[PDB]
DNA sequence: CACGTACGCGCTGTCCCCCGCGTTTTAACCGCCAAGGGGATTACTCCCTAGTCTCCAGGCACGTGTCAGATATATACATCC
DNA sequence: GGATGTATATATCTGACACGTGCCTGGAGACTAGGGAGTAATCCCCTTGGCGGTTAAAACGCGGGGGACAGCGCGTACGTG
C-alpha cells in the first residue's frame, strides 16, 4: 500500500529533541528530563498560534493573502513582545 | 581618529569579551587498529564438525563460535582482510560493528530461509543483491592508480619502497601506503603506467605558447596514432575535423550531437589531439555530471591511456589529498607551483564548492558536458564557470534549445562574450518578413559554431519511432473536481473531509491533478467508494474504482491488456510520483509484475531494477518512470512501447523520456502513446510544447553541421486506434480516442473469478 | 522608490562616537527600529499628557515630562539636560 | 576515555550562549508555521522574512522560558528541569493565569 | 541502542522556630477647632504663535568613476647541501 | 652545481570619496485666528498643630509541636558514546 496523504500533520514533532536541548543549553539548563519535549512543543504551538492568528487578522485587514514580516512585527508588538530588525 | 563625542554617564566599565576557554574544565576532559568493515562470513569456524543440527535458529553466543568473519581493519588497504573469530579478536574497537553485522545478517538471513511465506522472486533478488555486494567488495582489492612513491624506514628494515595506492571504487581518502613487492606482483600495468607518468614530457611546463599563432589545420582522413582506442568512425572523424577547424581560428563551440553517438569518444580524441599534435599539454578542465562520470573515466582509461587524467570527488580530506599530492609537480615549494596533471575531471558541485582553489589555474581548454544545465544565466554555475581564466571553452549537449532563445543567448554569451547580441524574442502570431529575416540571420550566424548529427543520418539501421496523441473524455468525478477548482467551491471542496485542508494555491497544478486522477486529492477515495462502490472494499471494487475514477486509466487498461496479449513491454512516464504510486498500486492489485523508478529510489535499487528489467529471463511487463530523473544514462534496450501519461512543459524532457527506449540498437518498432485529457489545462500545455518544438525545428534543426510554412504551422491551434504498427506537420494530429468503458464493464468476469478465489484463499489461510 | 529611514543620521552619530568603527545592515535596521519605537513611545506619552491637561498643543514641556516618565532614572536626567540645552541654542538662533 | 556526566552539558551551555545562530532548522519550522496558519484560513502565502521573524520570536520566547524554568528547578533544589517547572514559570508570568 | 552512574525521591531524625493563647499597652479612629492656602469652575481680555499658503533651493538618495590602502604575484640577491 | 629564504616592484580587490543629477521635502516670508496666558471671584478641600474618649488591634512572653533541613540509601532515568 503506497497510499499516504499530501498534508503532513506531525510537524510539531519537526521541532526535534536536540533542537529543544540546544534551546535549553542557550537557556543555561544542565539536565533535561524526558517529559520536557512534549510540554515545550505544546507551549511553542500555543505561542505560535497566538502570534499567527494576530498576524492573519492584520493581513486580512489589508485585504491580502500574503503574510508579510511587518504584520508579524505588529502582532508581536501588540502582545508586548516587540522585535527589532524587521521594522524597515 | 579621536572621538569627538563622549558620555557623561558614570556607568561602570564592562568587559564585553564573550570568548571563552575550556582549559579550566580540563579536569574531566582529556587532561589505531580496530574493526572497521566486515565483509563476508563462513559457516565453518575452524573445521566442519558435521551436517547435523542444521535446524532451529542460533543465538548470538552460538554464532560467536560457529562463524568466521572477513575483517577490513582501520587504516588498511582491503588486502589485509583477515578471517577472524570472536575469541580470536579479544576487545578491540569496532566490535559492535561485528555484533550488528552478525545479528542483522544472520537473523534475517535465517528468517528468510526458514519462513514458509517466501516467494522465489524475493529470494532471487536478495541472492543477486548478496552477489553484487560480494563482487563490489571484491573490487576493492584491485589497484587503480599509484599516486606517489617514497622510501620509508621500517623497524630495522633499512629502506623500503612504499607506494601510495588508490583502489577502484574507493576514493583518495582511502589511498594507502603499501609495499612495492605485492603491488608489482599484483598489477604491473598500473606500476609501469606510474613510471611512465614519472618521466613525463607532456607536463604543462613544456607547453606551446601560441599567441595568435595557430597552425593551419590539414584535414586528416585517418585516426592518428595519438589516440590508441578502437577506431573512430566517419562521423566521429568529421566531428574531430570540425572541432580542430574551429579551434584553428580560436573560436568556441557546441558539440550538439544526439545522445548515443559517442560524444565522449569525440571529445577525448580532441583532447588527445590537443595534447599531442599541437603541443598544448597544459591544464585542461572537464566538468561532467556525476552519474555519467565512470563512463568518462573508462573512456579516458581506454582511448587515451598515456594522459595524466585525474578525477575530483570526495569529502574535504580526499580533495585535500588530491590537492597536495597530485596537482603540483613541486608541492613542497613555497613559490608558484607548476601543474602535474593534464586533464581534471570534476562535477558542478565541486566547482561551486572549490571555486577559490580552481579559479586560480591558467586553464588551456574547458569542456562542459550537459550544457543545458548552463541554460540559465542567473544560475550560480554560470558565474562559477564564467569567472574562470580559460582561453578555449566547449559545450557538449544534445538539446541546445529547450524553452526560449534566451537559453541559446546565454550559451553563446558563455562561448563568445560580447560578440553575439541575441536580444529579440520570436513572436509566432506576427507573420512578418523581418521576423523571417531575423530567423535566417540566426541561422547563418551560428553555422560554424554548431555541429549536429541526427540518429537517422548516421547508423542506417534504426527502427522508426511513431508517437500518437490520444484525447479521451473526462469522467464525471474529474468534471466535478474541475468545475469545483476552476469556479472555486471551498464549501463543496471540503464537503465530507474532516480536516478541510484543501489548498487552492497553484491553480494550474490543481487542474493538472484533477485532469490526471481524482484520487490525488485528499479525502477523495472514500466518497467514490461509499456512494457508488458500496464501500465493501473486498479487493474487487477498488480496482474498478481506480479504473473508472479517471478518464485516462480506462484507455491505459485497454492498452495494458492489448500489450499483454501481444509480445511487448511498456514504460510509463509520469511527472508526479503520486500518480506513479497510483499506477503502482493499480498494477499491484491487478497482478502484473511491475517495476518503478523515481527520485526517492536510491541508485543501487535503480541499478537492480534496470538489470532486472533488461535481463532476458525477465517476468516484468511494465516499468514506471518519473520523467526528470536519472539523466541520460538509463538503459532500456528491452522496451518497445512508451506511454507519456503527463506532458511536460519542456519538450526536450519528453524527448529524452521516449528516447530511453529509442537508442542505437533497438530491435523493435518503438511506439509512443501520449495520454491527453480533453478540454482541460493540458491542451495549452501541448500548445506551448508544440510551439517550442516548432521553434527547435526552425532554428536548431535547419542549421545542422518553407520557413513561413512552418511559422504558419506553429501559429495555428491544433484542437485500429491502438495498433502497434505503422515533415514536421506529422505526429501532431489529435486522435480523440474515447471508447468510454462502463463501470460494470470495468471489472472482468474472467478476472472476477480469480479475484474471488484469491480472496477466499486469503480468508482461509488468514495471514 | 524613496524609502524613508534614519540611516545617515545614525551613521554620522556613530562617526561622532566612534570614527573608525563600521556598522552592518541588520544592526542599522535594529537602530532604525529602536529610534522609531522610542519616537512613538515619547510622542504617544506626550499626546496623552496633552490630552489629560486639556491642552491641544504639544510643546517642549510635554516631551520633557514624557522623557522623565519613560526613560528610567539617570538616563532621563542627562537626556533632559541634552535636549534642554539644544532648545536654548535654537532660541538663541531661531 | 569517557567524560563525566555534566561537563559536556556545561560545554554546550558555554558554546550555545556565545553563538547567535538559529537552533531550529528552517524547513520544519516553515512546515509548522504553515500547518498552524492553515486552520485560520486556507490559501495563505508567506514571506521568508515573516517566517524568519516568527523564528527569532520563538527562539527568544523559548530561551527566556528555559531560563525561568532553570531558575524554578534550582529553587526546588534540583538540577534537572521538569514540566512542573515550566508550568510554574508560565503561571507566575501570567500565561496560565 | 547499550551501559553506567548521578541524582530525584523516599525515609528518618532533630531541633528550632513559628503558631496559638493569654495579658498589657497603644495608637487608630472618630469627632473637634483655628486660620490660611491650593485648586476647580465661570467669565473676560489680549497677544503670541502655530497653521496655512506660495515659492524656491539644497539635502538625500542613487548611480558611477576614481583612489589610496590591503593582498597576491615576478624577479633578483643571499645561502644550504 | 642544484635548491631555498628574503627583498622591491606591479596587477587586483575593496571600501571610501569626489562629482553629477533629480526631486521632493524642508525652509523663508507673510497673514491670520485661536489657544493659551493672565486676572478676579467663589467655594470646597487640604495642611499643621493641638485636644478628648473608645476600643480593637498591636506588642510581648512562653510552651510546644509541626515542619524545615540534613543525612543516607536506591534504583532508575538520563547522560554519553
From Swiss-Prot, chain A:
Residues modified as N6-butyryllysine: 2, 17, 30, 63, 65, 77
Modified residues (N6-succinyllysine): 17, 63, 77
Recorded GO CC terms: nucleosome; nucleus
InterPro entries (alphabetical): CENP-T/H4_C, Histone-fold, Histone_H4, Histone_H4_CS, TAF_TATA-bd_Histone-like_dom
Residues modified to Phosphoserine: 33
Phosphotyrosine PTM positions: 37, 74
Residues with the N6-propionyllysine modification: 2, 17, 30, 63, 65, 77
Record PTM text: Demethylation is performed by JMJD6. Monomethylated, dimethylated or trimethylated at Lys-6 (H4K20me1, H4K20me2, H4K20me3). Monomethylation is performed by KMT5A/SET8. Trimethylation is performed by KMT5B and KMT5C and induces gene silencing.
Domain of life: Eukaryota
Modified residues annotated as N6-methyllysine in this record: 6
N6,N6-dimethyllysine, modified sites: 6
GO BP term, example: nucleosome assembly
Signal peptide region: none
Any GO molecular function: DNA binding
Residues modified as N6-acetyllysine: 2, 17, 45, 65, 77
DNA-binding region, residue range(s): 2-6
Modified residues (N6,N6,N6-trimethyllysine): 6
Name used for this protein in its record: Histone H4
Swiss-Prot record, chain B:
Annotated ranges, domain Helicase C-terminal: 555-705
GO MF: ATP binding; ATP hydrolysis activity; ATP-dependent activity, acting on DNA; ATP-dependent chromatin remodeler activity; chromatin binding; chromatin DNA binding; DNA binding; helicase activity
Catalyzed reaction equations: ATP + H2O = ADP + phosphate + H(+)
Main location: nucleus
Phenotype on disruption: Decreased sensitivity to the cytotoxic effects of 6-azauracil.
Keywords: ATP-binding, Chromatin regulator, DNA-binding, Hydrolase, Isopeptide bond, Nucleotide-binding, Nucleus, Phosphoprotein, Repeat, Transcription, Transcription regulation, Ubl conjugation
Domain characteristics, as noted in the entry: The 2 chromodomains are involved in the binding to the histone H3 methyllysine at position 4 (H3K4me3). The CHD1 helical C-terminal domain (CHCT) binds DNA and nucleosomes.
Protein family per UniProt: Belongs to the SNF2/RAD54 helicase family.
Subunit-level organization: Component of the 1.8 MDa SAGA complex, which consists of at least of TRA1, CHD1, SPT7, TAF5, ADA3, SGF73, SPT20/ADA5, SPT8, TAF12, TAF6, HFI1/ADA1, UBP8, GCN5, ADA2, SPT3, SGF29, TAF10, TAF9, SGF11 and SUS1. TAF5, TAF6, TAF9, TAF19, TAF12 and ADA1 seem to be present in 2 copies. SAGA is built of 5 distinct domains with specialized functions. Domain I (containing TRA1) probably represents the activator interaction surface.
Name of the protein in its database record: Chromo domain-containing protein 1
Shown residues in whole-protein numbering: 122 to 956 of 1468
Swiss-Prot record, chain D:
Post-translational modifications reported in the UniProt record: Acetylation is generally linked to gene activation. Acetylation at Lys-84 (H3K122ac) by EP300/p300 plays a central role in chromatin structure: localizes at the surface of the histone octamer and stimulates transcription, possibly by promoting nucleosome instability. H3R2me2a is present at the 3' of genes regardless of their transcription state and is enriched on inactive promoters, while it is absent on active promoters.
Residues with the Phosphoserine modification: 19, 48
Modified residues (N6-succinyllysine): 18, 41, 84
Modified residues annotated as N6-lactoyllysine in this record: 18, 41
UniProt keyword annotations, A-Z: Acetylation, ADP-ribosylation, Chromosome, Citrullination, DNA-binding, Hydroxylation, Lipoprotein, Methylation, Nucleosome core, Nucleus, Palmitate, Phosphoprotein, Ubl conjugation
Modification type N6-(2-hydroxyisobutyryl)lysine: residues: 18, 26, 41, 84
Residues where N6,N6,N6-trimethyllysine is found: 18, 41
GO MF terms held by the record: DNA binding; protein heterodimerization activity; structural constituent of chromatin
Keyword NAD: no
Cellular compartment(s): Nucleus; Chromosome
Modification type N6-methyllysine: residues: 18, 26, 41, 84
Record PTM N6-crotonyllysine, positions in chain: 18
Record-listed Phosphothreonine modification sites: 42, 69
N6,N6-dimethyllysine modified-residue sites: 41
GO cellular component, one term: nucleosome
PTM sites of type N6-glutaryllysine: 18, 41, 77, 84
Modified residues annotated as Phosphotyrosine in this record: 3
Annotated lipid attachment (S-palmitoyl cysteine): 72
Modified positions (N6-acetyllysine) in chain numbering: 18, 41, 77, 84
Similarity section: Belongs to the histone H3 family.
Subunit structure: The nucleosome is a histone octamer containing two molecules each of H2A, H2B, H3 and H4 assembled in one H3-H4 heterotetramer and two H2A-H2B heterodimers. The octamer wraps approximately 147 bp of DNA.
Function: Core component of nucleosome. Nucleosomes wrap and compact DNA into chromatin, limiting DNA accessibility to the cellular machineries which require DNA as a template. Histones thereby play a central role in transcription regulation, DNA repair, DNA replication and chromosomal stability. DNA accessibility is regulated via a complex set of post-translational modifications of histones, also called histone code, and nucleosome remodeling.
Name recorded for this polypeptide: Histone H3.2
Segment of the intact protein contained: 40 to 136 of 136
Amino acid at each position: 500500500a503506497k497510499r499516504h496523504r499530501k498534508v503532513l500533520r506531525d510537524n510539531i514533532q519537526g521541532i526535534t529533541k536536540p533542537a529543544i536541548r540546544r534551546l535549553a543549553r542557550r537557556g543555561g539548563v544542565k539536565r533535561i528530563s524526558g517529559l520536557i519535549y512534549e510540554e515545550t512543543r505544546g507551549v511553542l504551538k500555543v505561542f505560535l498560534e497566538n502570534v499567527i492568528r494576530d498576524a492573519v487578522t492584520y493581513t486580512e485587514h489589508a485585504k491580502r493573502k500574503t503574510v508579510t514580516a511587518m504584520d508579524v512585527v505588529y502582532a508581536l508588538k501588540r502582545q508586548g513582545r516587540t522585535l527589532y530588525g524587521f521594522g524597515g | 581618529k579621536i572621538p569627538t563625542r563622549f558620555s557623561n554617564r558614570q556607568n561602570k566599565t564592562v568587559n564585553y569579551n564573550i570568548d571563552y576557554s575550556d582549559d579550566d574544565l580540563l579536569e574531566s576532559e582529556d587532561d589505531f587498529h580496530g574493526i572497521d568493515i566486515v565483509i563476508n562470513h563462513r559457516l565453518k569456524t575452524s573445521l566442519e564438525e558435521g551436517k547435523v543440527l542444521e535446524k532451529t535458529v542460533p543465538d548470538l553466543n552460538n554464532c560467536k563460535e560457529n562463524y568466521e568473519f572477513l575483517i577490513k581493519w582501520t587504516d588498511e588497504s582491503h588486502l589485509h582482510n583477515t578471517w577472524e573469530t570472536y575469541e580470536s579478536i579479544g576487545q578491540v574497537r569496532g566490535l559492535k560493528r561485528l555484533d550488528n553485522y552478525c545479528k542483522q545478517f544472520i537473523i534475517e538471513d535465517q528468517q528468510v530461509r526458514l519462513d514458509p511465506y517466501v516467494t522465489a522472486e524475493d529470494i532471487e533478488i536478495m541472492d543477486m543483491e548478496r552477489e553484487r555486494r560480494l563482487d563490489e567488495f571484491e573490487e576493492f582489492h584491485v589497484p587503480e592508480r599509484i599516486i606517489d612513491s617514497q622510501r620509508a624506514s621500517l623497524e630495522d628494515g633499512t629502506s623500503q619502497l612504499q607506494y601510495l595506492v588508490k583502489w577502484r571504487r574507493l576514493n583518495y581518502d582511502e589511498a594507502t601506503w603499501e609495499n612495492a613487492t605485492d603491488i608489482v606482483k599484483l598489477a604491473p600495468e598500473q606500476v609501469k603506467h606510474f613510471q611512465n607518468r614519472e618521466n613525463s614530457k607532456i607536463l604543462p611546463q613544456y607547453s606551446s605558447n601560441y599567441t595568435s599563432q595557430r597552425p593551419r589545420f590539414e584535414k586528416l582522413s585517418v585516426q592518428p596514432p595519438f589516440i590508441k582506442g578502437g577506431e573512430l568512425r566517419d562521423f566521429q572523424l568529421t566531428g574531430i575535423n570540425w572541432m580542430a577547424f574551429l579551434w584553428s581560428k580560436g573560436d568556441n563551440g557546441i558539440l550538439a550531437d544526439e545522445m548515443g553517438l559517442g560524444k565522449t569518444v569525440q571529445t577525448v580524441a580532441f583532447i588527445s589531439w590537443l595534447i599531442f599534435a599541437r603541443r598544448q599539454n597544459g591544464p585542461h578542465i572537464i566538468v561532467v555530471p556525476l552519474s555519467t562520470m565512470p563512463a568518462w573515466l573508462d573512456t579516458f582509461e581506454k582511448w587515451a591511456p598515456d594522459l595524466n587524467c585525474i578525477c575530483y570527488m570526495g569529502n574535504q580530506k580526499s580533495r585535500d589529498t588530491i590537492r597536495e599530492y597530485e596537482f603540483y609537480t613541486n608541492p613542497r615549494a613555497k613559490g608558484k607551483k607548476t601543474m602535474k596533471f593534464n586533464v581534471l575531471l570534476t562535477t558542478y558541485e565541486y566547482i561551486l564548492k572549490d571555486r577559490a582553489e580552481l579559479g586560480s589555474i591558467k586553464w588551456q581548454f574547458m569542456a562542459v558536458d550537459e550544457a543545458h544545465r548552463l541554460k540559465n544565466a542567473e544560475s550560480s554555475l554560470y558565474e562559477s564557470l564564467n569567472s574562470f581564466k580559460v582561453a578555449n571553452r566547449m559545450l557538449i549537449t544534445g538539446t541546445p534549445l529547450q524553452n526560449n532563445i534566451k537559453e541559446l543567448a546565454a550559451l553563446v554569451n558563455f562561448l563568445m562574450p560580447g560578440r553575439f547580441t541575441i536580444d529579440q524574442e520570436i513572436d509566432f502570431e506576427n507573420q512578418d518578413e523581418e521576423q523571417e529575416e531575423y530567423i535566417h540571420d540566426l541561422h547563418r550566424r551560428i553555422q560554424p559554431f554548431i555541429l549536429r548529427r541526427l540518429k537517422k543520418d548516421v547508423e542506417k539501421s534504426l527502427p522508426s519511432k511513431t508517437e500518437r496523441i490520444l484525447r479521451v473524455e473526462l469522467s464525471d468525478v474529474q468534471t466535478e473536481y474541475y468545475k469545483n477548482i476552476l469556479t472555486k467551491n471551498y464549501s463543496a471542496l471540503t464537503a465530507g473531509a474532516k480536516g478541510g485542508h484543501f489548498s487552492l494555491l497553484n491553480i494550474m497544478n490543481e487542474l493538472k491533478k484533477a485532469s490526471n486522477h481524482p484520487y490525488l486529492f485528499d479525502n477523495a477515495e472514500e466518497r467514490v467508494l461509499q456512494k457508488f462502490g458500496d464501500g465493501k472494499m473486498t479487493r474487487e471494487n477498488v480496482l474498478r474504482g481506480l479504473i473508472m475514477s479517471s478518464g485516462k486509466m480506462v484507455l491505459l487498461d485497454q492498452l495494458l491488456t492489448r500489450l499483454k496479449k501481444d509480445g511487448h513491454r511498456v514504460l510509463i512516464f509520469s511527472q508526479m510520483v503520486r500518480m506513479l504510486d497510483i499506477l503502482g498500486d493499480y498494477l499491484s492489485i491487478k497482478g502484473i509484475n511491475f517495476q518503478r523508478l523515481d527520485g526517492t529510489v536510491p541508485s543501487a535499487q535503480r541499478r537492480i531494477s534496470i538489470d532486472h528489467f533488461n535481463s532476458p529471463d525477465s517476468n516484468d511487463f511494465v516499468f514506471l518512470l518519473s520523467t526528470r530523473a536519472g539523466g541520460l544514462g538509463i538503459n532500456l534496450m528491452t522496451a518497445d512501447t512508451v506511454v507519456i501519461f503527463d506532458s511536460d512543459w519542456n519538450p526536450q524532457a519528453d524527448l529524452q523520456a521516449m528516447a530511453r527506449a529509442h537508442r542505437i540498437g533497438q530491435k523493435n518498432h518503438v511506439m509512443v502513446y501520449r495520454l491527453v485529457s480533453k478540454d482541460t489545462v493540458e491542451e495549452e500545455v501541448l500548445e506551448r510544447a508544440r510551439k517550442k518544438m516548432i521553434l527547435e525545428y526552425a532554428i536548431i534543426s535547419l542549421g545542422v553541421t518553407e520557413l513561413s510554412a512552418i511559422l504558419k504551422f506553429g501559429a495555428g491551434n491544433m484542437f485500429d486506434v491502438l495498433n502497434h504498427a505503422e515533415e514536421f506537420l506529422k505526429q501532431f494530429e489529435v486522435t480523440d480516442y474515447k471508447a468510454d468503458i462502463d463501470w460494470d464493464d470495468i471489472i472482468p468476469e474472467e478476472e472476477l473469478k480469480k479475484l474471488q478465489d484469491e480472496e477466499q484463499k486469503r480468508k482461509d489461510e488468514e495471514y | 522608490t524613496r524609502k524613508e529611514s534614519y540611516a545617515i543620521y545614525v551613521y554620522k552619530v556613530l562617526k561622532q562616537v566612534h570614527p573608525d568603527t563600521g556598522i552592518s545592515c541588520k544592526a542599522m535596521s535594529i537602530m532604525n527600529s529602536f529610534v522609531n519605537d522610542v519616537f512613538e513611545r515619547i510622542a504617544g506619552e506626550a499626546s496623552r499628557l496633552a490630552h489629560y491637561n486639556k491642552r491641544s498643543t504639544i510643546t517642549s514641556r510635554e516631551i520633557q515630562t514624557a522623557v522623565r516618565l519613560l526613560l528610567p532614572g539617570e538616563l532621563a536626567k542627562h537626556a533632559v539636560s541634552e535636549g534642554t540645552k539644544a532648545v536654548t541654542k535654537y532660541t538663541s538662533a531661531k | 576515555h569517557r567524560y563525566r556526566p555534566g561537563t559536556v552539558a556545561l560545554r554546550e551551555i558555554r558554546r550555545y550562549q556565545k553563538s547567535t545562530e538559529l537552533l531550529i532548522r528552517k524547513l520544519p519550522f516553515q512546515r509548522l508555521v504553515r500547518e498552524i496558519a492553515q486552520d485560520f484560513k486556507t490559501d495563505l502565502r508567506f514571506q521568508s522574512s515573516a517566517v524568519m521573524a516568527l523564528q527569532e520570536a520563538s527562539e527568544a520566547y523559548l530561551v527566556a522560558l528555559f531560563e525561568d524554568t532553570n531558575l524554578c528547578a534550582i529553587h526546588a533544589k534540583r538540577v534537572t528541569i521538569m514540566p512542573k517547572d515550566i508550568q510554574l514559570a508560565r503561571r507566575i508570568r501570567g500565561e496560565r493565569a
